[PDB]
């Protein structure tokens, strides 16, 4: 049965790898179904708990079944990823390390940059017997020795690459050899290359898509404790559909510019808040009753938050919210203050954001 079990594992691995994408789409469909059901929650009796309200009564069991199905399909998606996409990542990394070792001497001529997680993690794999496991060129170690062996030291390069100087020739020499049989426990556990498997697991853990699928796992599991955690899975439409990815790329294309625009808006609003806190404090009474005056610009931080919140969200600037300046010695000053705030913050900066989006489209 040692061979039959391996055959069955191979069949399951192939099935998951082949049906990986269908399971990923099924997960999104189940997420939309679960959220559609969750859209009929209400709060009730004070003790607070959320109860499903419906006329069918079968929707709550339907929600339980759908949650279980989502959790199972997500695990199947992780398995399918590990069967299908992980080999490509290992192949790419194991090829890049080989090229860096041979045509750059990245572990012979020089040493990793001392801040490259990939570099110091890949320093492990060069000593493994199971190297070019996925990459085709099975002669990488021999090529490296033929290139750098004479100048830097054949023995130490053999140690670095995990090959045998005095044992290789001894094997070709004349002695009796003994075969081995794989299904033995000692044989299989020795065949398991612990160092190479550790390096592979590290690469998989450092993979971004695997981390995203693990986050999907965690959200799906937490949804059982709190069903609204399934709403986070609606954030998967961006990577589910290409057409939505186009619209989102129209935004993310100039993301750095968009962040810097918000920072500049914050600085400009802070300057306006400084001016208001120095000269126009008495216009920030947001209290209707005269008994309790509510001063919004007595404190610097409070005034800044006021300007950020109801100064920017206002359609006409801060002057829409703070009181009218008529019949005051600073009337023209506050008029200029409000008009300039409207022009620079409401008109120009938001225009900069919209123009960035349009230019990204173009």
């Amino acid at each position: 049965f040692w061979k039959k079990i391996i055959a069955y594992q191979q069949k399951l691995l192939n099935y998951f790898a082949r049906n990986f994408y269908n399971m990923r789409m099924l997960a999104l469909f189940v997420a939309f179904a679960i959220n559609f059901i969750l859209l009929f929650y209400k709060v009730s009796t004070i003790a607070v708990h959320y109860v499903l309200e419906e006329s069918s009564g079968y929707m709550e069991p339907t929600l339980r079944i759908l949650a279980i199905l989502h959790t199972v399909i997500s695990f199947f998606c992780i398995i399918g990823y590990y069967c299908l996409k992980v080999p490509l990542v290992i192949f790419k990394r194991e090829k890049e390390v080989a090229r860096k070792l041979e045509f750059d001497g990245l572990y012979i001529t020089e040493q990793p940059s001392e801040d490259d997680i990939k570099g110091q993690w890949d320093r492990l794999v060069i000593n493994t017997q199971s190297f070019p496991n996925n990459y085709w060129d099975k002669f990488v170690k021999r090529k490296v020795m033929d290139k750098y062996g004479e100048f830097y030291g054949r023995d130490r390069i053999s140690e670095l690459l995990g090959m045998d100087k005095a044992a290789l020739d001894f094997s070709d020499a004349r002695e009796k050899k003994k075969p081995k049989k794989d299904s033995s426990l000692s044989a299989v556990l020795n065949s398991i290359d612990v160092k190479y498997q550790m390096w592979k697991l590290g690469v998989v853990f450092t993979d971004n898509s695997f981390l995203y699928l693990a986050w999907y796992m965690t959200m799906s599991v937490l949804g059982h404790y709190n069903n609204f955690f399934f709403a986070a899975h609606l954030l998967d439409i961006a990577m589910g559909f290409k057409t939505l990815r186009t619209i989102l790329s129209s935004v993310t294309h100039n993301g750095k510019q968009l962040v810097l625009t918000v920072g500049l808006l914050a600085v400009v609003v802070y300057l306006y808040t400084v001016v208001a806190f120095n000269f126009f404090r008495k216009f920030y009474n947001k209290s209707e009753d005269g008994d309790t005056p509510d001063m919004k610009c007595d404190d610097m931080l409070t005034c800044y938050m006021f300007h950020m919140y109801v100064g920017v969200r206002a359609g006409g600037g801060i002057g829409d919210e703070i009181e009218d300046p008529a019949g005051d010695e600073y009337e023209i000053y506050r008029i200029i203050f409000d008009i300039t705030f409207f022009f620079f913050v409401i008109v120009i900066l938001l225009a900069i954001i919209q123009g960035l989006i349009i230019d990204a489209f173009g």
């Binding site: 399951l12 695990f75 801040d115 490259d116 398991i192 697991l201 590290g202 693990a214 796992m217």
Partner: protein
């Protein structure tokens, strides 16, 4: 310079090619220092001029500020420029750059913790995961597997990946804790 001139002016002399091959190393030492241009010669014919580019000049040239100035000058001369004034503007830029480079040469007269924490978290967590396989305690499970069972085989196949995912969770938590300690 002599050999480069001869080689460039005569490209198909096998004797010169062999002689250059003999002269390979010396011609490789001076390659950064040998500078060559083409000028509209006095005899109404294009000629090649060879000279010595100093090491200090090259370093000051590939200083980043000089590169920014070069990009700005190229942008200016391309957008608002005429082919009549292009070579005058280029010489003005050359003069200004040479002066600033000489002044710079005059004045210039003589995280790892995060990476280590993340890597140690990887090593420790993966070794913790692999210990359950390395303990040789899978003898009772091997005995339970000696009799073929569909539920057993599917459970083992799923449990391997479940354990990998749990190990990833522990690794992420350890990295978060380490980064929190480092920042605080």
């Amino acid at each position: 310079v002599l050999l480069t001139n001869l080689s460039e002016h005569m490209p198909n002399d096998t004797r010169l090619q062999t002689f250059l091959e003999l002269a390979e190393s010396v011609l490789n030492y001076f390659q950064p220092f040998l500078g060559r241009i083409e000028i509209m010669g006095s005899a109404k014919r294009i000629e090649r001029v060879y000279f010595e580019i100093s090491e200090s000049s090259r370093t000051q040239w590939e200083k980043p500020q000089v590169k920014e100035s070069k990009r700005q000058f190229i942008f200016d001369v391309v957008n608002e420029g005429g082919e009549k004034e292009k070579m005058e503007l280029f010489v003005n830029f050359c003069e200004d750059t040479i002066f600033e480079m000489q002044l710079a040469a005059q004045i210039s007269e003589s995280s790892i913790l995060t990476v280590r924490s993340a890597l140690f978290a990887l090593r420790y967590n993966i070794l913790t995961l692999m210990r359950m396989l390395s303990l040789k305690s899978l003898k009772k499970q091997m005995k339970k597997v000696k009799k073929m069972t569909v539920k057993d085989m599917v459970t083992a196949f799923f449990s391997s990946y479940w354990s990998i995912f749990m190990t990833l969770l522990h690794f992420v938590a350890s990295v978060f804790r380490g980064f929190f300690r480092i920042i605080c």
